[PDB]
């Protein structure tokens, strides 16, 4: 059930603050999101296709 | 405390001699200056994958194979490559590609692990990463007989940290 | 003699237990170990080893006329099966860091219709055992009911290893009453402070055998009743494979 | 009703089974676990050291009225190191330690009520803490709360003239003014790395070395509290309140002494 | 204070001699260590059914009959099975089935009854549960002439408790 | 996983790349920057001069506990001019200034 | 900016605390050096 | 240095092998061990133990300038992995009567572009090993090619343990040619005189390492090349669970 609290008013602090956050873990693991934000260093020119090419060795 | 960013491979494979032994603790004096460790020291617990990256810096003419293992706790640290080989490990072959990224899997009874040590953690901590030579560094005439392997650490995509606190204050000097 | 809806068999690998006088299997907490992987481990578990999911049978002790009420014997798990008597279970257990398992037990003891007495068999999580997690050696009434306090702690009210045996029936249990049965069957699920256990330093479950109504009989009746047990790990799941523990002892 | 208790389970009845009667049920909600522990109870009296408000913290106790407290309902202290940082214990220490001594009042710090009645093996909850100064005059109190398993040696003073408790980004609370009500209240989250906490005993060691000492599971508390303040002569009571309590696996409670007297008890 | 979890039946039925007499008070020193009593001591009042369970532990060869009675207050405790038999009672016959569950009906002027006693409750309390032999324990040759009967207590489905408080503090030692 | 760190960027993995494993992600928000710095921390102790309530202000410090403070997390003060208006510094000053001295508690004011 | 203080208890000192509201940071860079434990293979606290 | 469609990894449990110079995996007989139960056993097998299906890596020996053509080293299976170095494989193996498995091997040896020489690595069913089924200790040309005959058998043409090494390539094999590769990868299915094996007295498969073109190099080049191997049991299936073999040795 619930405890000993019987106030009519909506809790002034939201729940994620008033209480701990119950989480549940699934047995088989979970995939991290793909990206944690948009910060990134980028590697360009990695590959090919296009230059002063095919004078270039085989 | 004469820290260098690398380990040295030799022309001899002693199964009894690790090239490196790191404790898997975000408190290892080994990690003390990595961003991982500096970041982590402001939180109470962590979870997830740790990534040890090795960059071979020797000659192109050299050749060799390493056995990198992660040993969970319980039976103490392995004392020979033969015991390490009984745990999680990978064989790193030298060739065109310069580095090797070894991920130590989060193996733990609790969902999270404490970041920092209170006192020092024994024979505990969460196990060990040991690096061994499988085959010796081999080379042709006219080439040095040892090479430096750069060692770095990072978080895996799995890695999480929780509850911000403050480490014990220190002075870099 | 023993009857009908009381005649029961339990097959475990190449192992099978039979009783001709059961009273049913008490499933504690009303659930069984599901054999599911611990969500705290990234490594895939070694599970479903047939050679491991069977009954290990050995002797507990001897029940005599002398035992007093509430004297008991403790069998710490998984520890009791971590040695040589643990077969492939033990062998696998000693090379893994972590184990997650349930237990299925049968304790046995026969007498006759001319004997009187009753045992209480229960299984309890975090029951206080010997330091070294070994089966008790002899019956004892040791440290009941207030726990073990320090020598000097002259006025201390009690210690945290207290055990008020008047309430031992709060634990999953069954009575081995000589006029009624010869066997007791219990099963418990996995329970612990964490999703899997570092069994090495924690005996999370204890099988306890206690006398509650002392053994009585007239002359010529059997005089000492042996007590044996069959223990089976229920869908154990291992993780964190490394070299052998070794000093297994 | 005839029955067979050996099965380990017994059918429940009302007067209705054997006699000509009627059930007499009436609803009540005070027996729910959450409701029952959702009230404050004291764990002991504490003290602040002189001039702690402006210097390095150091373990210390006034009359076995220390300086810091571990947030846990279980025993802790050990009156023999009243001047050392407190620790969790596996037994409660009487008031005296020799025959002629007394059990009450206890010397260690604990939620005696919780100890006396906790019929469960494991529990989970949030902790509501109340600090109450034993004075109705002004009182200044600085509190530092450290989550379980984090640094608990708030010993280095880093800022000239500032308490070492008052350092960092670790939660610090401070009440001190002529118009305060002197008391402090707040609720802390659940920070053990453990899924659920041992309520009485934990049958395992601290290291895999099995340097044998069973009883307490590591990091199974709600953290440590450090105090600094201005009335080094006033003591304050610390109270715990279990917010949204959950318990698992019933187990026995503390033994109650046989009335080598009547056929009933009372009070005290 | 030399508590044992059972009562003993003999080979003699004295109508003048109860095997047990329990006062129906959640304060009886008799119940002092039952979970019922330990639970109940944290509340001010109770209501509903109390269940006394008896488990026969003697030989299979023994036979016997018990008279278990509940006497409401008002006229004092019964002094012979003949007086007990005038109140609420049950006859328990020994045979294949090992135990007997006796429920004492909640008979009271008030909706609820106080849990604990302030002082001691006289000749009061709420009456008595008395156990008597109707017929003596009988047996064949080669069998013991007395048996132990295990005694337990629990709440009935009816049972309720209200108003959480704290008992007077005690020390188990 | 074989890799080439020279590129200046390294592919991130989980135990899943080289072994038979599973990802073990669980959400948390305490690592966001805003959340992390959105808590109070001290920068030092200050003092007021006698009868400043009714007279001209003047730089002054009590025990290297000055009168005014620059709002910045960086070092400032310079204990040598405890009686001059404070200034931002490029280094933190130890508690003492000679061998036998001590680093804590610091003399300058900073987060 | 700068803060100037005047008051009535010239003998009481006060602590000043900062709290960063809606922090935004750009370009990661290194943090302060931590001394090599010329001791163990781990640290602690203090 | 080593390249591209030559860079290859093999994951086994918590084990993974990498090479940067492969020539492919030779699958002998063109089939792999299916992991199917032996049709000669009524008992259900213990199979699919993750802790067992991985690579065991240890050292074979040292290749030197001195070895002559056709000198070899033998590694009897499953025997080599039946001891302590066999991990849970060994442990399980010692408590079962019978085992049915395939093998997946990788043998390793690096030199440089200035070294010359080649090894022949092959796997052979019923290859004649030491009595005691142990790995050869030193390189030998022992009892090639006519087998071992009795002392007195002065005129005997040959013995049944003959081995005409000129034809060793009839066996599943791959060459470890220093100018070409650093690793050799082989896999063999289950083959035997019966549906499952009483491994205790039969080493049905042997991994053989032989020199075919002796090691050559100029001064300053590496002088001794170590030879190591990674061996993995492929879907082993165990039957006939009993107590431990014990003298495991």
PDB file of C-alpha atoms in Angstrom, chain D residues 1-4 7 9-19 21-25, chain E residues 36 47-54 99-106 152-160:
ATOM      1  CA  UNK D   1     -10.805 -28.913  12.057  1.00  0.00           C
ATOM      2  CA  UNK D   2      -8.545 -31.927  11.590  1.00  0.00           C
ATOM      3  CA  UNK D   3      -5.295 -30.994   9.833  1.00  0.00           C
ATOM      4  CA  UNK D   4      -1.738 -32.241   9.040  1.00  0.00           C
ATOM      5  CA  UNK D   7       3.104 -30.388   5.106  1.00  0.00           C
ATOM      6  CA  UNK D   9       1.329 -25.260   5.412  1.00  0.00           C
ATOM      7  CA  UNK D  10      -1.835 -25.084   7.460  1.00  0.00           C
ATOM      8  CA  UNK D  11      -5.345 -24.101   6.229  1.00  0.00           C
ATOM      9  CA  UNK D  12      -6.692 -20.951   7.972  1.00  0.00           C
ATOM     10  CA  UNK D  13     -10.013 -20.794   9.644  1.00  0.00           C
ATOM     11  CA  UNK D  14     -12.403 -18.644  11.606  1.00  0.00           C
ATOM     12  CA  UNK D  15     -14.829 -19.823  14.289  1.00  0.00           C
ATOM     13  CA  UNK D  16     -16.960 -20.926  11.490  1.00  0.00           C
ATOM     14  CA  UNK D  17     -15.172 -24.179  10.730  1.00  0.00           C
ATOM     15  CA  UNK D  18     -16.002 -26.132  13.859  1.00  0.00           C
ATOM     16  CA  UNK D  19     -18.839 -24.203  15.559  1.00  0.00           C
ATOM     17  CA  UNK D  21     -20.474 -18.890  14.299  1.00  0.00           C
ATOM     18  CA  UNK D  22     -19.961 -16.019  11.832  1.00  0.00           C
ATOM     19  CA  UNK D  23     -16.779 -14.323  10.525  1.00  0.00           C
ATOM     20  CA  UNK D  24     -16.073 -11.006  12.121  1.00  0.00           C
ATOM     21  CA  UNK D  25     -13.863  -9.144   9.719  1.00  0.00           C
TER      22      UNK D  25
ATOM     23  CA  UNK E  36       1.553 -13.576  16.756  1.00  0.00           C
ATOM     24  CA  UNK E  47     -10.098  -8.443  16.920  1.00  0.00           C
ATOM     25  CA  UNK E  48     -10.933 -11.807  15.460  1.00  0.00           C
ATOM     26  CA  UNK E  49      -9.954 -15.468  15.683  1.00  0.00           C
ATOM     27  CA  UNK E  50      -7.017 -17.054  17.433  1.00  0.00           C
ATOM     28  CA  UNK E  51      -5.851 -20.490  16.209  1.00  0.00           C
ATOM     29  CA  UNK E  52      -4.312 -23.059  18.523  1.00  0.00           C
ATOM     30  CA  UNK E  53      -2.830 -25.943  16.479  1.00  0.00           C
ATOM     31  CA  UNK E  54      -1.924 -29.294  18.107  1.00  0.00           C
ATOM     32  CA  UNK E  99      -2.935 -32.406  13.899  1.00  0.00           C
ATOM     33  CA  UNK E 100      -6.023 -30.542  15.075  1.00  0.00           C
ATOM     34  CA  UNK E 101      -6.683 -26.791  14.529  1.00  0.00           C
ATOM     35  CA  UNK E 102      -8.917 -25.338  17.328  1.00  0.00           C
ATOM     36  CA  UNK E 103     -10.228 -21.768  16.740  1.00  0.00           C
ATOM     37  CA  UNK E 104     -11.218 -19.684  19.740  1.00  0.00           C
ATOM     38  CA  UNK E 105     -14.159 -17.580  18.666  1.00  0.00           C
ATOM     39  CA  UNK E 106     -13.960 -13.822  19.285  1.00  0.00           C
ATOM     40  CA  UNK E 152       1.418 -23.637  18.024  1.00  0.00           C
ATOM     41  CA  UNK E 153      -0.655 -20.441  17.638  1.00  0.00           C
ATOM     42  CA  UNK E 154      -1.594 -18.221  14.633  1.00  0.00           C
ATOM     43  CA  UNK E 155      -4.119 -15.588  13.560  1.00  0.00           C
ATOM     44  CA  UNK E 156      -7.420 -16.763  11.925  1.00  0.00           C
ATOM     45  CA  UNK E 157      -8.644 -15.173   8.638  1.00  0.00           C
ATOM     46  CA  UNK E 158     -10.785 -13.005  10.862  1.00  0.00           C
ATOM     47  CA  UNK E 159      -7.904 -11.456  12.838  1.00  0.00           C
ATOM     48  CA  UNK E 160      -7.141  -7.751  12.653  1.00  0.00           C
TER      49      UNK E 160
END
